[PDB]
């Protein structure tokens, strides 16, 4: 299987997951995409401390189970998130400290893991344990104040509670190998493995943006941790701007590491993202697949002019015009600039540098032309493996009008038919 993310990842023994919000399980558009595309689920908030133990000793798995059941019922495994960390703690726990806190932490772990014993693939036992101050040390938290050994204690407690779950340490900004935070975690995990502390995986949240950008050395980081004898997982991936290239690079980084279990993107549609402003996911609010989706799928499936297969002619802007609204056509292939198209990370097909292949509408017969680039979804395109080029907004295929093949044949949008007049090759 290779038309969906999860199925494609499965080809190499991995998974492709997302974060599920219980409040959206009633949204048909949401669940249609989620159930179809992913085979691993993480509760976005339903399994956190405050949600699972609102009152000390008073556990509530209502929201957590709703997500877990939806996942398993729809063929997805589940990553437990999260058992012990400083954020989103319930009121009662926030007012705790010292030995009473340590005991509360242990009790919480036993209660939650006990409830899901044997049903969880991976548990983010501890997360956000390190600081961003650049020192490479632990962050000052109620948990940390109970003693530096709290992390180790949490893992040992977890192993005993559910020996079948892979136990991960999860954090952010630990992707770039040169960062001090990354080294602090690396040193901790190494020490743990040397002393026999039960840790099976390290989760890299992968929340990339211009503030903490993706760097190719992320693969090295994954490989270095893998070499320590633990599995690695990309747990909450989202990329500011959703560059097709960056999304493909991250996907390939996991595929290049034997120990990388899989990749989870933090949400389904940009509208469901905790950072919608950064439009960091693989699907748009209207549910359309972004160019990034195609890039990720292509990667999971095993990794200039635009020539029409059926006509043998190239996508051409009539008389090298630069006028907005000029409908494109088929023409004998040559080296002029009016036949050179660049596919950008934003999914555009540019010509002349600042002009974009543009759909003047959404229905069949819609004119395909050039127009000033501005970021519209009607200027976004998906270059599919079968040679088809689909408009993001319309969901229709680039089509040579009436199957025409002669110079001057115009280009339009039309329901995809896999016809020769809808297949294109770049050469």
Ligand X SMILES: [N-]=[N+]=[N-][C]1O[C][C](O[C]2O[C][C]([O])[C]([O])[C]2[O])[C]([O])[C]1[O]
Catalytic residue among 44, 53, 175, 236: 236
Asked whether 208 and 246 are in contact (CB, 8 A), the reply is yes
CB of 97 to ligand X, least distance (A): 23
| Cis peptide bond N-terminal to 82, omega within 30 | yes
CB of 272 to ligand X, least distance (A): 9
Q: Taking the alpha carbons of 46, 35, 73, 230 in that order, is the dihedral positive or negative?
A: negative
Question: For ligand X, which is the closer residue by CB, 121 or 281?
Answer: 281
Residue 175 falls in the annotated catalytic set: no
Query: Structure tokens of 91?
Result: 């009121």
Q: Which among 334, 338, 319, 327 is positioned nearest to 410, based on CA atoms?
A: 327
Euclidean distance between CA atoms 230 and 169, whole angstroms: 11
The answer to whether 289 contacts ligand X (rule: CB under 6 A) is no
Question: For ligand X, which is the closer residue by CB, 19 or 373?
Answer: 19
Q: What is the CA radius of gyration of the chain?
A: 25
φ, ψ of residue 201 to 5 degrees: the values are -155, 160
Residues in the chain: 427
Distances (CA, A) of 49 to 127, 141, 151: 12, 15, 16
φ, ψ of residue 409 to 5 degrees: the values are -60, 130
Angle at 226 between CA 221 and CA 232, to 5 degrees: 80
CB of 365 to ligand X, least distance (A): 42
Question: For ligand X, which is the closer residue by CB, 22 or 243?
Answer: 22
Euclidean distance between CA atoms 366 and 368, whole angstroms: 6
CB of 207 to ligand X, least distance (A): 5
Question: For ligand X, which is the closer residue by CB, 127 or 379?
Answer: 127
Please select the residue that binds ligand X; options are 172, 208, 225, 343, rule is CB under 6 A.
Answer: 172
Euclidean distance between CA atoms 129 and 184, whole angstroms: 10
Annotated binding site for beta-D-galactose: which residue ranges?
316, 319, 329, 334, 338, 399-400, 402-403, 421
Question: For ligand X, which is the closer residue by CB, 172 or 218?
Answer: 172
Question: For ligand X, which is the closer residue by CB, 225 or 331?
Answer: 225
Binding mask 183-222 for ligand X (x = CB under 6 A): ----------------------x-x---------------
Question: For ligand X, which is the closer residue by CB, 210 or 335?
Answer: 210
The answer to whether 127 contacts ligand X (rule: CB under 6 A) is yes
Euclidean distance between CA atoms 343 and 32, whole angstroms: 29
The answer to whether 236 contacts ligand X (rule: CB under 6 A) is yes
Euclidean distance between CA atoms 157 and 275, whole angstroms: 34
Please select the residue that binds ligand X; options are 18, 35, 39, 45, rule is CB under 6 A.
Answer: 45
CB of 274 to ligand X, least distance (A): 4
CB of 239 to ligand X, least distance (A): 13
Distances (CA, A) of 314 to 89, 247, 336: 60, 29, 11
The answer to whether 270 contacts ligand X (rule: CB under 6 A) is no
Neighbours of 169 (CB within 10 A): 24
CB of 205 to ligand X, least distance (A): 5
Please select the residue that binds ligand X; options are 274, 321, 345, 416, rule is CB under 6 A.
Answer: 274
Collapsed DSSP state (helix, strand, coil) of residue 328: coil
The answer to whether 44 contacts ligand X (rule: CB under 6 A) is yes
Site size toward ligand X, by CB under 6 A: 8
Q: Which residues pair with 17 in a beta bridge?
A: 40, 264
Q: Which residue has the tokens 């590491």?
A: 257
Angle at 113 between CA 238 and CA 199, to 5 degrees: 65
Annotated binding site: which residue ranges?
316, 319, 329, 334, 338, 399-400, 402-403, 421
Q: Which among 195, 330, 291 is positioned nearest to 187, based on CA atoms?
A: 195
Q: Using CB under 6 A as the criterion, which residues of the chain lie in contact with ligand X when the complex forms?
A: 44-45, 127, 172, 205, 207, 236, 274
Please list the active-site residues: 236
């Amino acid at each position: 299987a290779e038309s969906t993310l999860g199925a494609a990842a499965a080809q190499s023994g991995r998974y492709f997951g997302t974060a599920i919000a219980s409040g959206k399980l009633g949204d048909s558009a949401y669940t249609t995409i989620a159930s179809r595309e992913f085979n691993m689920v993480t509760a976005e908030n339903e399994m956190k401390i405050d949600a699972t133990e609102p009152q000390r000793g008073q556990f509530n798995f209502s929201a957590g189970d709703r997500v877990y059941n939806w996942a398993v019922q729809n063929g997805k495994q589940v990553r437990g998130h999260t058992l012990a960390w400083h954020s989103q703690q319930p009121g009662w726990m926030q007012s705790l400290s010292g030995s009473t806190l340590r005991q509360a932490m242990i009790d919480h772990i036993n209660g939650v893991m006990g409830h899901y014993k044997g049903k969880i693939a991976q548990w983010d036992v501890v997360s956000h344990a390190f600081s961003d101050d650049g020192s490479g040390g632990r962050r000052d938290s109620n948990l940390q104040r109970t003693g530096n050994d709290w992390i180790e204690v949490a893992f040992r407690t977890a192993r005993a509670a559910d020996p079948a779950a892979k136990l991960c340490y999860n954090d952010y900004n630990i992707e770039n190998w040169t960062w001090a935070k990354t080294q602090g975690v690396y040193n901790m995990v190494r020490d743990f493995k040397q002393r026999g502390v039960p840790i099976d995986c390290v989760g890299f949240q992968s929340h990339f943006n211009s503030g903490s950008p993706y760097n190719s050395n992320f693969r090295t980081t994954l490989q270095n941790f893998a070499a320590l004898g633990v599995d690695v997982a990309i747990t909450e991936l989202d990329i500011q701007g959703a560059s097709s290239s960056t999304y493909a690079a991250v996907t390939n980084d996991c595929l290049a590491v034997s120990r990388c279990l899989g990749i989870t993107v933090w949400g389904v549609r940009d509208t469901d993202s905790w950072r919608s402003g950064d439009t960091p996911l693989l699907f748009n609010g209207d549910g359309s697949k972004k160019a990034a989706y195609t890039a990720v799928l292509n990667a999971l499936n095993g990794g200039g002019q635009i020539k029409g297969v059926g006509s043998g002619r190239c996508l051409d802007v009539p008389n090298a015009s630069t006028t907005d609204g000029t409908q494109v056509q088929l023409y004998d292939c040559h080296s002029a600039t009016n036949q050179q198209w660049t596919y950008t990370d934003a999914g555009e097909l540019r010509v002349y540098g600042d002009k974009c292949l543009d759909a003047a509408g959404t229905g069949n017969g819609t004119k395909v032309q050039i127009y000033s680039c501005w970021g519209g979804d009607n200027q976004k395109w998906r270059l599919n493996s079968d040679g088809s080029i689909v408009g993001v907004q319309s969901g229709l295929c680039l089509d040579a009008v009436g199957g025409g093949t002669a110079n001057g044949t115009l280009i339009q949008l039309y329901s995809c038919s896999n016809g020769s007049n809808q297949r294109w090759t770049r050469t």
